[PDB]
């Protein structure tokens, strides 16, 4: 699993440092094992339509 | 000249060092500093 360029969020979500929205608080979180397993479930569901 | 090179690994290393320097892991427990200071917030995307 590859990740996007880190500079995308720095210039867009953290464009203003004196404000805090729903996106900015969770742009700094990290996933656990079960959450990665759920991501794998989502991708498996996508790759078999219907 | 104080030069900072575009190589990502170096910028990450200075970023980590500055984050340690401003907010160290040791007195973040004892002194219970507030994270709302303008400098510590500015540290988030200062050298990205």
């Amino acid at each position: 699993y590859i990740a996007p360029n880190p500079r995308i969020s720095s210039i867009t979500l953290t464009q203003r440092i004196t404000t805090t929205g729903p996106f900015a608080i969770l742009t700094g979180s990290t996933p656990t094992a079960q959450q990665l397993n759920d991501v794998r479930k989502i991708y498996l569901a996508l790759m078999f339509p219907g | 000249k104080i030069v900072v090179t575009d190589d990502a690994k170096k910028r990450y290393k200075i970023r980590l060092q500055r984050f340690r320097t401003h907010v160290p892991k040791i007195k973040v427990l004892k002194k219970l500093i507030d994270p709302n200071r303008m400098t510590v917030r500015n540290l988030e995307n200062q050298f990205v």
């Binding site: 805090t20 900015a24 608080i25 742009t27 700094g28 979180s29 | 980590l16 984050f19 907010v23 973040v28 219970l32 507030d34 994270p35 709302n36 510590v40 917030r41 540290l43 988030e44």
Partner: peptide, 13 residues
């Protein structure tokens, strides 16, 4: 590896 937004969450304990 840390972000300033997680600092508020871990700090508010």
């Amino acid at each position: 590896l840390l972000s300033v937004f997680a600092l508020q969450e871990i700090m508010q304990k």
